[PDB]
Amino acid sequence: HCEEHLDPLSIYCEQDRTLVCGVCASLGSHRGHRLLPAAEAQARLKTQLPQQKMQLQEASMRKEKTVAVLEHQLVEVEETVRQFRGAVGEQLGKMRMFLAALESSLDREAERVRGDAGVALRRELSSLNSYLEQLRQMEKVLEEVADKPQTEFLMKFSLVTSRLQKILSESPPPARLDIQLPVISDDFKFQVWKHMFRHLMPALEELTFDPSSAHPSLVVSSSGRRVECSDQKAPPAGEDTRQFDKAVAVVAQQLLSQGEHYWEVEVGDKPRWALGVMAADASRRGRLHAVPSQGLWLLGLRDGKILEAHVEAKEPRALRTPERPPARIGLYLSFADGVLAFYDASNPDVLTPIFSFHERLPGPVYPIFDVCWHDKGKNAQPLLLV
Amino acid sequence: HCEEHLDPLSIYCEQDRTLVCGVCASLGSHRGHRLLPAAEAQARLKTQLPQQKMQLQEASMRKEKTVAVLEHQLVEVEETVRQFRGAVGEQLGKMRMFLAALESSLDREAERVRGDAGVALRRELSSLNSYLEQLRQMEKVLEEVADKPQTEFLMKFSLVTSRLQKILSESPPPIQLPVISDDFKFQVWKHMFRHLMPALEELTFDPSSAHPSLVVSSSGRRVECSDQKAPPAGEDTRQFDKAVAVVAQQLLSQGEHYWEVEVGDKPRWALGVMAADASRRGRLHAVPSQGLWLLGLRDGKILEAHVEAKEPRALRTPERPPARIGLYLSFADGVLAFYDASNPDVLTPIFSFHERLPGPVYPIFDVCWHDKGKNAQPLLLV
Ligand SMILES: [Zn+2]
Numbered sequence: 001h002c003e004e005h006l007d008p009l010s011i012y013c014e015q016d017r018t019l020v021c022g023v024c025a026s027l028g029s030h031r032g033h034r035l036l037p038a039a040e041a042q043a044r045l046k047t048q049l050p051q052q053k054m055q056l057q058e059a060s061m062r063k064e065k066t067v068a069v070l071e072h073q074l075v076e077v078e079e080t081v082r083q084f085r086g087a088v089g090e091q092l093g094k095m096r097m098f099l100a101a102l103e104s105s106l107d108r109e110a111e112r113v114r115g116d117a118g119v120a121l122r123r124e125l126s127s128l129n130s131y132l133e134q135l136r137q138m139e140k141v142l143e144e145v146a147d148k149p150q151t152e153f154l155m156k157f158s159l160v161t162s163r164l165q166k167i168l169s170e171s172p173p174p175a176r177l178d179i180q181l182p183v184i185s186d187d188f189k190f191q192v193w194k195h196m197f198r199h200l201m202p203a204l205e206e207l208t209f210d211p212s213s214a215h216p217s218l219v220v221s222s223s224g225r226r227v228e229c230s231d232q233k234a235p236p237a238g239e240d241t242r243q244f245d246k247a248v249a250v251v252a253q254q255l256l257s258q259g260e261h262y263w264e265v266e267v268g269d270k271p272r273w274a275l276g277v278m279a280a281d282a283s284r285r286g287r288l289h290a291v292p293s294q295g296l297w298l299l300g301l302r303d304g305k306i307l308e309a310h311v312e313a314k315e316p317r318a319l320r321t322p323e324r325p326p327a328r329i330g331l332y333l334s335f336a337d338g339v340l341a342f343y344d345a346s347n348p349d350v351l352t353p354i355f356s357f358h359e360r361l362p363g364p365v366y367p368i369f370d371v372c373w374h375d376k377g378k379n380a381q382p383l384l385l386v
Numbered sequence: 387h388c389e390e391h392l393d394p395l396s397i398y399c400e401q402d403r404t405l406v407c408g409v410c411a412s413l414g415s416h417r418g419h420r421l422l423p424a425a426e427a428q429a430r431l432k433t434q435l436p437q438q439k440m441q442l443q444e445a446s447m448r449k450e451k452t453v454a455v456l457e458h459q460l461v462e463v464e465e466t467v468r469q470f471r472g473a474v475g476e477q478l479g480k481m482r483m484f485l486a487a488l489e490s491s492l493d494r495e496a497e498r499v500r501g502d503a504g505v506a507l508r509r510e511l512s513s514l515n516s517y518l519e520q521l522r523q524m525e526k527v528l529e530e531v532a533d534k535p536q537t538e539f540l541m542k543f544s545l546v547t548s549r550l551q552k553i554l555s556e557s558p559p560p561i562q563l564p565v566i567s568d569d570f571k572f573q574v575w576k577h578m579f580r581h582l583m584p585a586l587e588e589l590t591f592d593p594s595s596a597h598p599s600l601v602v603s604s605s606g607r608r609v610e611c612s613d614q615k616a617p618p619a620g621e622d623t624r625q626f627d628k629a630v631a632v633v634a635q636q637l638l639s640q641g642e643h644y645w646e647v648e649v650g651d652k653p654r655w656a657l658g659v660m661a662a663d664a665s666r667r668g669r670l671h672a673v674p675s676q677g678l679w680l681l682g683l684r685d686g687k688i689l690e691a692h693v694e695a696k697e698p699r700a701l702r703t704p705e706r707p708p709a710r711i712g713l714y715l716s717f718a719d720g721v722l723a724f725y726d727a728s729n730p731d732v733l734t735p736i737f738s739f740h741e742r743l744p745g746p747v748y749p750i751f752d753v754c755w756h757d758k759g760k761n762a763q764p765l766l767l768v
């Protein structure tokens with residue numbers, strides 16, 4: 001039963017793992033190998049069965065886990081696609097709503113203009129028709145008087161002449177048309193675009209000044225929305241980390257952590273001030289270095305006209321100063337993009353860029369406002385939360 | 387017939403303008419006034435009738451003409467309101483069309499990404515399912531072999547082991563959707579500014595007016611200065627002779643227009659508008675008082691506006707030299723604006739004239755000197 005020697009298979013070669021006969025084991029294929037008979041070789045081979053079963057179970061577990069992960073990824077892909085579609089739809093419907101609102105406002109303005117113009121034209125028509133009726137009556141009276149007897153003519157002619165002179169001196173005023181219809185020019189699209197930039201911003205963040213953190217020389221009135229520096233020399237402050245001691249400034253009660261936020265601060269005619277954000281974990285006392293490495297993103301105006309951005313450098317970076325110092329500053333903060341942008345909000349229709357931070361913000365931060373020293377009275381202008 | 391003296395009325399008082407009798411004129415009401423007879427007074431009073439009639443006719447004519455004009459305006463009020471509504475609708479429908487197109491494009495991109503990701507993940511799932519099917523078949527083969535006769539066991543165990551080792555050693559080796567952030571609105575806005583412009587005005591260079599040293603190819607949309615010596619030009623006032631430049635065949639007169647010129651890697655060039663009545667030959671002074679509104683780039687990086695002054699006004703030079711310049715011209719507001727059209731997504735402002743332009747003007751392009759060959763880059767109308 002050797003298939004080559006007609007001898008029954010009775011010897012198992014360990015290193016070849018094949019049944020052979022006695023001739024093959026004595027001389028030939030497996031004469032110098034490690035050879036055993038059935039029993040012990042079979043035992044040694046079945047000893048390896050638990051290892052194979054454990055490896056197979058491990059491989060099956062790994063493959064099933066990978067399949068489950070891929071199915072979870074397919075589900076998350078579907079959810080992500082739906083979320084992206086909905087988010088794009090909402091963000092574009094914002095601008096669509098703005099454009100529809102502008103069109104509606106212009107349409108109601110046109111309705112009012114039509115009504116007023118019609119009323120005014122009807123008034124002028126009534127006035128001129130009454131005046132022309134008076135003219136017609138006077139002309140017919142004159143024509144009838146001109147064909148009267150001598151005495152009646154010479155008695156009524158002067159009365160008729162006086163009446164005619166009176167009605168000719170009582171001419172109706174001109175009463176200019178005044179067609180108050182807003183005419184559109186070619187720049188209408190650009191103006192709408194520049195206003196749409198303002199409508200793109202989020203709602204005005206309702207902030208209130210925190211007196212428990214403000215400098216002792218500052219005072220907060222107008223329901224916590226008007227902070228101003230006092231002209232009194234203040235004693236040194238306490239050992240509180242969250243209260244300013246040398247730099248006269250104040251942070252808001254609200255801490256921003258996530259999303260986008262926008263807020264406007266009115267400085268008016270204040271010659272020296274600063275606005276921005278401060279890290280919540282950074283100490284607020286002592287001499288402060290307005291650098292992002294110390295948790296301070298600030299834009300300042302000094303000497304009444306010099307506008308500086310407090311970027312990470314030895315000295316603040318000078319910026320292109322406008323004709324007049326901006327009277328209202330808008331601040332936009334985006335955590336998802338880590339951007340703090342300062343805009344000139346003096347024009348209610350258009351916001352113009354001042355400076356923007358593009359550095360990765362750790363967060364969360366506090367809105368901080370540095371109302372500087374009153375400087376013997378010429379810096380008593382307050383800071384107002386719009 | 388005095389009604390007070392029974393004497394007929396025959397004396398007219400000039401300062402009282404009333405007929406009286408002789409008694410009234412001799413003693414009483416009108417004894418010291420200026421008095422005339424009755425018939426002469428009637429003649430003198432009827433002399434004044436034509437003046438009164440003419441004044442009445444003039445006043446009536448004036449008032450009736452004003453009434454007719456006001457009636458026409460009353461009729462036309464509705465037309466004026468309709469015109470304003472339609473103009474506003476068109477100006478806003480521009481942005482509405484842009485937003486609809488952008489939303490459709492984003493939706494198609496998202497659908498394509500979703501389809502590709504689903505196909506790839508299903509392919510990987512099918513591959514792993516086939517691998518697990520192979521594992522199951524091998525496991526069942528092993529379980530069936532483990533209960534075989536002793537000879538069959540000793541002759542198939544090692545083949546099964548080798549196959550299992552092979553299939554275990556040959557295991558298979560194994561987010562790209564753009565999510566929108568808060569700056570998505572601002573990016574859409576900055577892209578919308580470009581679509582706010584009207585259609586690209588199809589202009590073609592005029593060879594009959596260009597300098598003889600220039601050559602116009604690509605169906606009249608690519609003008610370039612050749613490095614070959616050209617013959618002198620003719621004595622035509624509308625053809626450039628010293629300043630190597632070219633104007634377009636089309637003259638803009640009314641409305642708003644926008645056109646883009648590709649300069650590419652050209653170091654020195656100029657673009658703008660020229661008055662149709664200003665002479666084009668000889669040394670030219672690029673000043674608005676002479677019908678020339680030009681923006682130039684020299685030395686590869688210096689950007690200058692040719693405003694009315696002794697020297698051109700230097701402008702903030704960008705990081706890189708602009709590769710495409712867009713020109714917008716509006717007659718209703720008299721504005722010529724130059725924008726950097728290098729980025730197809732966003733246009734950045736360069737300079738804009740806000741002076742009232744008389745018009746009409748020609749789009750003029752100054753492709754500067756060849757400069758011994760290093761200025762042979764062409765100018766292409768996009
Ligand atoms: Zn044998």
Ligand SMILES: [Zn+2]
Pocket residue numbers: 013015016029030031033
């Ligand atoms: Zn052997």
Ligand SMILES: [Zn+2]
Pocket residue numbers: 195199
């Ligand atoms: Zn608005």
Ligand SMILES: [Zn+2]
Pocket residue numbers: 388390391393406407408409410411
């Ligand atoms: Zn009398």
Ligand SMILES: [Zn+2]
Pocket residue numbers: 399401402415416417419
């Ligand atoms: Zn008298």
